[PDB]
Design a binder for this molecule. Structure first.
Ligand SMILES: [Mg+2]
Ligand SMILES: [Zn+2]
Lengths: 237, 83, 27, 56, 578, 87, 687, 225
């Protein structure tokens, strides 16, 4: 049949990577059917890379004090966890961060091999007190969604390398709500209000477009059972 | 300071409006007399002109005169004397 | 019980009461 | 209470009323002397500022 | 507030007639009136246009106090029932068992301005009587925030620092990462973690430790061992408010909203209360507070307790049967024995229950109810009164889970009916007393700003101990708060700590108690010197705003309503006749 | 009280008087004058053709001809739909 | 219950204001002669009561009560009717006492009732009278509450009071769990056509049943279809017997308004969860599914009655006809050639029902009306229209038209020639605002009607119907509804305990043929002798599955719901089951009420009061106190001058709103000038 | 990451209900996916149902026909249970004539070309020796629930009886997921969806229409970039 009212999609722009969309008006149940689906698809369906396991020389079992540095080991672990890095190779590549002498390490002091790239060179990671030396070997790979600490199944390199989590998803915090526009002339329709905040890897409009593309290629399976079945056609743009 | 955006009838905030009057009762008679002046301007535009000036801030599409008076008081564009 | 076209409504009662309910409009 | 008795001895003494409590002003429909009814607030003159008068 | 559109079309009929004459939809007001009566479909858009930003009044009889009439901005709602905001039910004393509310309508510009500024809903949060907030969370959202902010030892994803072969695996770099790890089935909301927060103000000790002067958290980073739930809760609160890290009992929420009302403007308090309502409902659904008869647990050793007190009652009855004592003495002995047995069964039931029982969570979170209703649910009912007021010495030895018997039900009915008739008589007497008080004190209004007297009453204000320590007097917040000092405050013939003419809020009272002074001479309306009403400095702070009272307020009717309103809850010469 | 003021017919009467004044002003001066003096629209006294021909200095038959001409002029849909909607 | 109702007011009795507080309480002589539960709960508590079940009135006017006499500890069957005095002369045993199936008790120390209303433990030889049964001290309407012994007295009062405000639905399904009082309370209420004599059915129809007795004679029972009750509800009567069936004396032959197959049926059976859902069921509000709106589960007929009469006047006589002055022919197409509407025409709010025109007389004409009539040529039309119009907020079809006429020689009051009555009926659905209640005082309006998709469905796709709230259960002490919910789920799904190793221990005192039951089987737990906790718990643990092997409800009575809105499961199991709820007579359409400008009073000039008219709300005394306490003087001046009494001011206010100007300044009210004229009339120079 | 697009197989249990299994999926996704498909399936499937009936001897809804055992409102409550599938969008009409004694089932309704009644065994009403039933119906397309559209809203005569309509061919839909999610991060979800229809349309056609609606609406957020 016909939708009898074509919905729109308009993007409002907050601070640079915190856009906020509205979709209005929808058929009176159709807010929640696509709201939660879009939230989960924005979160756990976009590819991207992150750190997976690091290794610090000089640490053997204590995991608590690195000599010559000021900050804790766990501070370096979560500072490395909040490091945006994009890959192009679907296999585990390694990195290195080498610095001796007193001063302060930044994220731009790392050296990227071929294919990977860092999107915040002015990010603070560690400080070296006096005459210290930092030599940390990172492992960067890609995937989807959030994934916890993969345990030491390959226990051969387990003495040096310690595992962390991986925020593969380029979006961070997506929330949503519905509304109640035009209860009389349009008879209680819905207005979905999205809110997405990404990192600087992709703009949220492009994240929304990739999520919509994966969703429609997911529902193409359910569409391709009886192609000549009558649905609800919206019409043209 | 920065709190949130208001919406609807609570715009402008009365916590900012009460920094321009003594008490709330003076604020009420202030806004009511300014709104009566604005509506007396509007219903005399058809005939010849008079001294009933207003509004000073730009009105909305279809905005009540009392809301225009409250926005004018928040813009610090009028003066008042008590009794 | 004691009404012929009654639906079979199975009871949980333990006490076997002697006296049936009187005519409700006799008052 | 005792609207007979209250009214007759007031009628003897020729007692005049002054309309200052907020009970009597409710009865005759006049503006009550509280809140926005007292003379400090009821006679506020409102006029636009002379700097902003020339702005339009 | 919601509005049934078929009623709002009837209220706003001249406005919509003028508006649909002005837009060319009818040639005069006669065809416009017939167009309204036939309900042609253009009148809905015209009705929305004339409804927008035009307040209405709402009203539920009986109007007990000043917050019984509150203005609202309408918006059109389908159906036929008035939709009411779920936070003003405490002010209106309204539940949804079939109560009706009247809607009036202000007309002139003065009436619209009065309803928009003075009588708005979001402008009246606090009491006019005591200053505590009336827009506080209640029955459901308190349970929601209690479940959201409580802390479970050893839940899924709890932080352990055990660092042998593997690191701690409890830390999280950001609340966004923690929200992802809880969206996946790893982190529970109530497990203890160590986030790295960059948007919430740390408490005073951590702020003075890490940054000293002003740790302005919009850029700063600091670690905190909390749950995810308390972080999600503290994100509802404003930026300048510090971190809390507590368990949101109802008194804790009362203290939070009181502090927010004291140190902030009103609009921030209204928005914070709306956010708290939304979070409280959304987590009240996921809390899992249901009621089953497998959840009403009985105490296991109830029967031996009842047998022991039954043997004591049997000895007392046999001693009466000997003739060694009269009727009234054995009645007193049986009353004492069964009161002891009731309290023993209540103690055993109190110590038998776990903490995650819904019937104890709803009680202990301060949502609703007390413990005696849970004792009468599972346990023992206890003594039941007579029609006169004596105690039946039998007593009821059953509970409503086990089911009563015929005579015990017949005994309970006496006290039930006495309570009902007491309720009717008490609300009639409260109405009459409110009428008398309003009829006396209606001509006490504020007239001047400062009468400039020197007399004043004295307050006790935290007398000391035999050891010498100044213990805080319990009745300070009713007696000494919100008052203006008539004389100065000197300590041990030293420095003057708080000068004359100050509001006596929290921190100066804390400073007086820290300096170690008890008696203070404060101003009050007993010693005011104006002839027509009281002055503004003698009355002190108006409780409804928090600032000084104005020069036109009618404080007499406010006082009379604040006295006569809670008289219905005065459940008794010690009651409302007292 | 069925003999009270309905308070919509009163403002309808005032609006009808204003529309009647505008419609009679869409005619000429003499035509509006003879119609107002014929039907007593300004004082409440219906004069006759003798008095109208006296105040204008012409025969009663000329006044009657002018009155019939104006009644034919007012009986138009364009001139009279706004008055038709008042009944 | 309107019969068998005992009051203390009226002529020859004490007034309400003179009612002593001691006469409202329950004396201990009320055991078996008056219900201590069922009474009105306004300012009439205890002044109005109802009779008990087994009670009886003496020839002198005192109230008798049966008792089982017992000699030497052997309980006989000689039933003796005692009054209060000779009840006090003896000592009275307990109903539920353990009798040895030989007449004798099993313990000497029995519960007993002494002379002055005391409760003791007498040895089992002084006992000379026993009760006949339980439920002797209870009324009829209170004896229809399952698990009454688990509820508090106030909520049982509210439940027994709200059980009779239920409305008759259009389908009227019998309750799953009930007592044994529905059948007798239905066939004694008189609203069920009972077969007078045993015989065989000859012919059924929708209008009459003709039976054939054993000896020749036949009798036809005329049904009542769509008869109006005294409060607008409907009174249908449908048969339940087929063509060739054979009936006996006293057998039910036709249902009534609220009956199903013989027994009472005041509501429907609905699946229910006890979770708090998103603040929509906050503070006793109820949310429902859309299935009840879709499938006519809670819908009822309502029949209203209008009336008009053509009197005679001085100037002539009013006539009923079509020739209505100044009314278009578009709205005159419904009614027939003689004025009244035809049967079947759907009317809206404000259409013409009976065309009636009155003579009016002669008046002077304004010059503008004269000129418009001269322009348009419309005539004078000296007669005035006072027709019969359907009032505001009503609609529906037209069932019946009853007309009385003077020329057909009926009895009428003096001067009335034609009386005509029109019956309009409508089919009211369920809606938000309408009031629902269970059988335990758990009332509450409908907060929201969700669609069928966003409603928390069960583990196999079944959506729930209503959603109650948890916080209203424990603090009101009425967990009888929780026991009814558990036993309703058991009675819906059907159970079968396992007698392989004998009967389990909890079901030892459980009677036979309840060890297994089919699904959708009815049961009856009586008032004070019903289900027990061990019986219900063990029966709830063995509750055979639905279609697949899927026990949807575990041993605690709960189930793992799914959130129909987001999609995730709810993390904790929720209590579900089958309750029995009823629709009450507090619908929104009888309550929603508004007024801009309508009819005014005559003596005073205030707007008239009441929903029957347009009607304005009373702005009382305490509301004036609140408006003074706010300080808003202008709103109070407006509310007391230009909305009530300023007779020259109301027209100016309406004119100023219509023309779009400022509201003018209020004048002196009419009440003050009336007071001034009275004081001047009473020889007091008020100046 | 994994590189495997999900597939959809089909599993038949009876003629009017079947099972659909989708695998693999992302973790924490099968619940939301199945709920979105259920929310579409349960509300937005186009079908057909009766709209307004007109018996000859009656004039309104609250009367009785001479001869039948039930009344007109019980005939409405029985005819609201019909299941009927149409083919074209203009409102066709079907008739029903039955004389004399006997039970009038839904199989006695004679349909025009294009529509069909699927359960002929449905009881409508029962007659006697003097009974005579003659009724015509109006079938119409649509989707969702819609109340009885009033007689004044159209221009029909007095004999028309507007009935409520429920064009919804689906009956009961649930799902469940099988979360493997082992401790090796080869994690996925396997969603099993269940559809049951009321013998009007096949479950494959119902799921095809739901998938078409989702593919239409979810593509709105793609090509507006
Ligand atoms: Mg209530
Ligand atoms: Zn003073």
């Amino acid at each position: 049949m016909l939708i009898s009212q074509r919905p729109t999609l308009s993007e409002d722009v907050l601070t640079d990577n915190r856009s906020q969309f509205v979709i209005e008006p929808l058929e009176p149940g159709f807010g929640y059917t696509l709201g939660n689906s879009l939230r989960r698809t924005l979160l756990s369906s976009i590819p991207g890379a992150a750190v997976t396991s690091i290794r610090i020389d000089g640490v053997l079992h204590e995991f608590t004090t690195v000599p010559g540095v000021k900050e804790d080991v766990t501070e370096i672990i979560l500072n490395l966890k909040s490091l945006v890095v994009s890959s192009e190779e679907d296999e585990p590549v390694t990195m290195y961060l080498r610095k001796q002498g007193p001063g302060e390490v930044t994220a731009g002091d790392i050296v990227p091999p071929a294919g990977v790239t860092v999107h915040n060179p002015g990010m603070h990671i560690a400080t070296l007190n006096d005459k210290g030396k930092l030599e940390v070997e990172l492992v960067v790979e890609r995937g989807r969604g959030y994934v916890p600490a993969v345990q030491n199944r390959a226990s051969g390199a387990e003495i040096g390398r310690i595992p962390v989590d991986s925020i593969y998803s380029p979006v961070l915090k997506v929330t949503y709500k519905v509304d109640a526009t035009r209860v009389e002339q349009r008879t209680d329709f819905d207005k979905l209000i999205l809110d997405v905040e990404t990192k600087n890897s992709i703009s949220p409009r492009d994240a929304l477009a990739s999520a919509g593309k994966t969703l429609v290629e997911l529902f193409g399976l359910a569409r391709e059972l009886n192609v000549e079945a009558e649905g609800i056609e919206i019409g043209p743009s | 300071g920065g709190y949130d955006t208001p919406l609807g009838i609570t715009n402008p905030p009365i916590d900012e409006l009460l920094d321009r009057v003594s008490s709330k009762y003076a604020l009420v008679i202030y806004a009511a007399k300014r709104a009566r002046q604005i509506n007396d301007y509007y219903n005399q535009l058809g005939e010849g002109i008079l001294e009933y000036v207003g509004p000073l801030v730009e009105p909305g599409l279809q905005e009540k005169p009392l809301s225009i008076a409250l926005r004018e008081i928040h813009a610090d564009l009028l003066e008042h004397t008590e009794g | 019980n004691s009404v012929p076209g009654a639906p079979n409504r199975v009871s949980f009662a333990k006490l076997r009461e002697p006296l049936e309910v009187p005519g409700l409009l006799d008052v | 209470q005792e609207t007979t008795r209250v009214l007759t001895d007031a009628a003897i003494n020729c007692r005049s009323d002054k309309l200052n409590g907020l009970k009597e002003n409710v009865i005759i429909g006049k503006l009550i002397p509280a809140g926005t009814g007292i003379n400090r607030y009821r006679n506020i003159a409102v006029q636009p500022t002379e700097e902003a008068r020339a702005a339009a | 507030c919601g509005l049934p559109k078929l009623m709002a079309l009837e209220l706003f009929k001249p406005f919509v007639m003028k508006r649909l004459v002005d837009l060319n939809h009818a040639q005069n007001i006669k065809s416009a009136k017939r167009m309204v009566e036939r309900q042609r479909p253009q009148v809905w858009d015209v009705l929305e246009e004339v409804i927008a930003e035009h307040p209405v009044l709402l009203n539920r009889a009986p109007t007990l106090h000043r917050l019984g009439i509150q203005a609202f901005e309408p918006m059109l709602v389908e159906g036929k029932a008035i939709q009411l905001h779920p936070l003003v039910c405490e002010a209106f004393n309204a539940d949804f068992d079939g109560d009706q509310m009247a809607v009036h309508l202000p007309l002139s510009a003065e009436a619209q301005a009065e309803a928009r500024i003075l009588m708005l809903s979001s402008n009246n949060i606090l009491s006019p009587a005591s200053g505590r907030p009336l827009a506080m969370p209640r029955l459901d959202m308190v349970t929601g925030l209690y479940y959201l902010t409580t802390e479970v030892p050893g839940d899924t994803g709890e932080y352990q620092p055990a660092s042998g072969d593997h690191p701690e695996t409890g830390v999280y770099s950001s609340p966004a990462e923690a929200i992802m790890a809880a969206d996946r089935g790893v982190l529970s909301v109530r497990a203890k973690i160590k986030v790295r927060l960059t948007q919430l103000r740390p408490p005073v000790e951590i702020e003075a430790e890490l940054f000293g002067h002003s740790g302005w958290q919009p850029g700063d980073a600091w670690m905190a061992e909390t749950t995810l739930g308390r972080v999600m809760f503290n994100e509802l609160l404003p930026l300048g408010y510090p971190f809390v890290n507590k368990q949101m009992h109802k008194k804790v929420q009362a203290a939070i909203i009181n502090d927010l009302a004291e140190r902030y403007p009103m609009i921030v308090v209204a928005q914070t209360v709306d956010k708290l309502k939304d979070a409280g409902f959304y987590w009240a659904t996921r809390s899992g507070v249901t009621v089953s008869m497998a959840d009403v647990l009985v105490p296991p050793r109830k029967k031996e307790i009842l047998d022991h007190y039954e043997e004591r009652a049997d000895k007392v009855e046999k001693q009466f049967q000997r003739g060694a004592l009269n009727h009234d003495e054995r009645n007193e002995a049986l009353v004492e024995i069964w009161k002891e047995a009731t309290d023993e069964v209540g103690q055993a039931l109190r110590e038998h229950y776990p903490d995650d029982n819904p019937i104890i969570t709803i009680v202990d979170s301060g949502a609703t109810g007390n413990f005696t209703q849970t004792r009468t649910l599972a346990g023992m009912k206890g003594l039941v009164t007579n029609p006169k007021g004596e105690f039946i010495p039998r007593p009821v030895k059953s509970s409503f889970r086990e089911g009563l018997t015929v005579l015990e039900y017949f005994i309970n009915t006496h006290g039930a009916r006495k309570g009902l008739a007491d309720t009717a008589l008490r609300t009639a007497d409260s109405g009459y007393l409110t009428r008398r008080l309003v009829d006396v004190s209606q001509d006490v209004i504020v007239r001047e700003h400062d009468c400039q007297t020197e007399r004043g009453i004295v307050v006790e204000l935290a007398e000391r101990a035999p050891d010498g320590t100044l213990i805080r007097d319990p009745y300070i917040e009713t007696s000494a708060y919100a008052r203006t000092l008539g004389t100065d405050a000197v300590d041990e013939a030293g420095n003057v700590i708080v000068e004359r003419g100050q509001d006596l809020g929290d921190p100066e009272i804390d400073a007086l108690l820290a300096a170690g002074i008890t008696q203070v001479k404060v101003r009050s309306v007993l010693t005011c010197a104006t002839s027509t009403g009281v002055c503004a400095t003698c009355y002190g702070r108006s409780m409804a705003t928090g600032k000084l009272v104005d020069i036109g307020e009618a404080v007499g009717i406010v006082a009379a309503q604040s006295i006569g309103e809670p008289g219905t809850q005065l459940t008794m010469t010690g009651g409302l006749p007292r | 009280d069925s003999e009270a003021v309905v308070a919509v017919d009163a403002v309808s009467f005032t609006l009808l008087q204003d529309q009647l004044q505008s419609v009679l002003d869409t005619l000429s001066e003499r035509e509006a004058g003879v119609v107002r003096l014929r039907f007593g629209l300004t004082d409440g006294q219906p004069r006759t053709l003798d008095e109208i021909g006296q105040v204008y200095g012409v025969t009663r038959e000329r006044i009657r001809q002018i009155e019939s001409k104006t009644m034919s002029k007012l009986r138009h849909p364009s001139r009279s739909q706004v008055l038709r909607d008042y009944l | 219950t309107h019969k068998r109702r005992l009051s203390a007011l009226g002529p020859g009795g004490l007034s309400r204001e003179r009612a002593g507080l001691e006469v409202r309480d329950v004396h201990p002589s009320h055991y078996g002669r008056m219900c201590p539960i069922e009474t009105p709960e306004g300012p009439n508590i205890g002044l109005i009561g109802s009779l008990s079940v087994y009670a009886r009135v003496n020839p002198f006017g005192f109230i008798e009560t049966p008792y089982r006499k017992v000699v030497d500890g052997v309980v006989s069957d000689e039933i003796v009717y005692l009054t209060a005095d000779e009840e006090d002369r003896h000592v009275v045993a307990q109903a539920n006492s353990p009798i040895d199936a030989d007449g004798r008790f099993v313990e000497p120390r029995v519960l007993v009732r002494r002379k002055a209303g005391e409760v003791e433990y007498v040895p089992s030889s002084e006992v000379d009278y026993m009760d006949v049964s339980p439920r002797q001290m209870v009324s009829v309407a209170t004896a229809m509450i399952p698990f009454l012994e688990h509820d508090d007295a106030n909520r049982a009062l509210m439940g027994a009071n709200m059980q009779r405000q239920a409305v008759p639905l259009v389908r009227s399904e019998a309750p799953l769990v009930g007592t044994g009082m529905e059948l007798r309370a239905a066939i004694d209420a008189g609203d069920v056509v009972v077969a007078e004599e045993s015989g065989v059915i000859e012919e059924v129809s929708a209008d009459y049943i003709t039976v054939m007795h054993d000896n020749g004679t036949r009798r036809t029972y005329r049904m009542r279809k769509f008869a109006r009750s005294n409060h607008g509800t409907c009174a249908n009567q449908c048969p339940i017997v087929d063509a060739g069936d054979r009936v006996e004396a006293g057998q039910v032959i036709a249902d009534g308004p609220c009956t199903d197959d013989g027994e009472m049926a005041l509501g429907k059976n609905l699946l229910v969860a006890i979770m708090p859902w998103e603040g929509h069921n906050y503070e006793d509000a109820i949310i429902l599914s859309n299935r009840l709106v879709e499938e006519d589960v809670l819908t009822s007929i309502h029949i209203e009655e209008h009336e008009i009469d053509a009197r005679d006047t001085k100037l002539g006589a009013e006539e009923i006809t079509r020739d209505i002055p100044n009314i278009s022919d578009e709205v005159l197409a419904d009614l027939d050639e003689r004025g009244i509407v035809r049967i079947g025409a759907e009317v809206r709010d404000g259409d013409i029902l009976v065309g009636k025109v009155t003579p009016k007389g002669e008046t002077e004409l304004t010059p503008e009306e004269r000129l418009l009539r001269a322009i348009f040529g419309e005539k004078a039309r000296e007669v005035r229209d006072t027709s019969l119009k359907v009032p505001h907020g009503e609609s529906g079809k037209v069932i019946g038209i009853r007309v009385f006429s003077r020329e057909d020689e009926d009895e009428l009051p003096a001067g009335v020639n034609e009386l005509v009555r029109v019956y309009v009926a409508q089919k009211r659905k369920i809606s938000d605002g309408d009031k629902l209640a269970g059988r335990h005082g758990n009332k509450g309006v409908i907060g929201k009607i969700l669609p069928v998709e966003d409603m928390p469905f069960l583990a196999d796709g079944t959506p729930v119907d209503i959603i109650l709230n948890t916080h209203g259960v424990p603090r009101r002490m009425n967990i009888g509804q929780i026991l009814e919910t558990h036993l309703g789920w058991c009675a819906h799904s059907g159970w079968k305990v396992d007698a392989a190793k004998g009967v389990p221990d909890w079901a030892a005192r459980l009677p036979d043929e309840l060890l297994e039951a089919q699904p959708n089987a009815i049961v009856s737990t009586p008032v004070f002798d019903g289900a027990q906790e061990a019986e219900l718990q063990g029966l709830l643990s063995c509750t055979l599955p639905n279609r697949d092997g899927d026990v949807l409800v575990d041993a605690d009575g709960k189930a793992m719901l799914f959130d129909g809105r987001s999609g995730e499961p709810f993390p904790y199991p929720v209590t579900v089951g089958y309750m029995y709820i009823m629709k009450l007579h507090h619908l929104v359409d009888d309550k929603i009420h508004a007024r801009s400008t309508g009819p005014y009073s005559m003596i005073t000039q205030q707007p008239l009061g009441g929903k029957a008219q347009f009607g304005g709300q009373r702005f009382g005394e305490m509301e004036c106190w609140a408006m003074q306490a706010y300080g808003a003087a202008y709103t109070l001046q407006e509310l007391l001058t230009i909305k009530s009494d300023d007779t020259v001011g109301r027209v100016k206010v309406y004119e100023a709103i219509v023309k779009g100007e400022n509201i003018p300044e209020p004048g002196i009210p009419e009440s003050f000038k009336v007071l001034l004229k009275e004081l001047q009339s009473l020889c007091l120079n008020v100046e």
